[PDB]
Amino acid sequence: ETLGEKWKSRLNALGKSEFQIYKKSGIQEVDRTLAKEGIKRGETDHHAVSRGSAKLRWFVERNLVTPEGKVVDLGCGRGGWSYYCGGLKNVREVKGLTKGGPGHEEPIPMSTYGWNLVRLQSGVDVFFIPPERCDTLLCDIGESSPNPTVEAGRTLRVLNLVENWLSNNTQFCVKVLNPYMSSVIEKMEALQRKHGGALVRNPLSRNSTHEMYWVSNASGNIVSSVNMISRMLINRFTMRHKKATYEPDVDLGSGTRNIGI
């Protein structure tokens, strides 16, 4: 049943080195060697806390998601999406939330452009806190699993979360870990019916995830766009040139922002 599931099993059948080779075959990457060595030293200016900033940049530079006003970042991790939104013109406030703790990503304090508008807190489980007013809602939650039914449940769980934070006309960028399972496809169709947007594949995503993002300023038939990605991921199982094309990492500048009137 379904292309994505067929893709999933071939993926699970892949050897430990076949998997790694496949994971990056023909994908788009961000050159992060030097930014990570800077962060390690302790630099807090210019650098991105993770490859997630570049990730979000791809969507924003194409108006698929136009962050503005108060931005809530569910599952901010180190703060990749949050610090990036902190430098955008129309952004007034950014609030990031994560689980944190031993063996989980924790926010890293930075001084990138507009950091003073960024509040990052860990020790928080977004699934059980009351929804807050939000102009733009970001969510990058979704732990992958060898079992597609497990991911299907994790995905429905975040889709039900973001729904209660979604008011009408809120800008959003929500990760949909497993968009191919039949039960997630159904929910996404409902969600889109009530809230526009569409699922879009980020070229920076690795081939090892069927990861798609529900973005507000986009359109397209759900089933149609998901199968399009399933075929793409299956095609990449057998590639002659599998070199990943790199791009310089994002520069988040430095300094406080003075929004004023």
183, 234, 176: which is closest to 201 by C-alpha? 176
| Residue 73 is labelled as binding a ligand | no
Question: Which segments of the chain does DSSP mark as H helices, in order?
Answer: 3-13, 16-23, 33-41, 52-60, 80-85, 148-163, 182-194, 222-235
Q: What angle, rounded to 10 degrees, do the helices at 3-13 and 222-235 form?
A: 30
211 is an active site residue: yes
Instruction: Give the one residue of 10, 104, 133, 243 binding ligand SAH; rule: CB under 6 A.
Output: 104
DSSP at 126:
G
| Cβ pair 204, 54 in contact under 8 A | yes
Q: 139 has which bridge partners? A: 74, 174
Q: Does 211 bind ligand SAH (CB under 6 A)?
A: no
| Catalytic entry in 151, 175, 187, 249 | 175
Q: How many helices (H) and strands (E) does the chain have?
A: 8, 9
Binding to ligand SAH by CB under 6 A, coded x per residue (else -) over 144-173, reads ------------------------------
Rounded CA-CA distance 149/9 in Å is 12
Nearest-CB residue to ligand SAH? 52
Active-site residue identified among 73, 105, 151, 211: 211
Query: Judged by CB under 6 A, does residue 249 bind ligand SAH?
Result: no
Name which of residues 52 to 81 contact ligand SAH (CB under 6 A).
Answer: 52, 75-81
Contact 188, 222 (CB under 8 A): yes
Is residue 4 at the binding interface for ligand SAH, with CB under 6 A as the rule? no
Phi, then psi, of 188 in degrees rounded to 5: -60, -35
Q: Is 141 in the site for ligand SAH (CB under 6 A)?
A: yes
Chain length of the chain: 261
Catalytic annotation on 163? no
Identify the residue among 25, 50, 171, 225 touching ligand SAH (CB under 6 A): 50
Cβ closer to ligand SAH: 57 or 195?
A: 57
Q: Which of 73, 105, 135, 140 is catalytic?
A: 140
Q: Please identify which residue in 105, 135, 151, 249 interacts with ligand SAH, judged by CB under 6 A.
A: 105
C-alpha span between 73 and 91 (Å, rounded): 13
Q: Is 222 labelled as part of a ligand binding site?
A: no
Q: Give the nearest distance from C-beta 106 to ligand SAH in angstroms.
A: 8
Binding-site positions for S-adenosyl-L-methionine: 50, 80-81, 98-99, 125-126, 141, 213
Q: Using CB under 6 A as the criterion, which residues of the chain lie in contact with ligand SAH when the complex forms?
A: 49-50, 52, 75-81, 97-99, 104-105, 124-127, 140-141
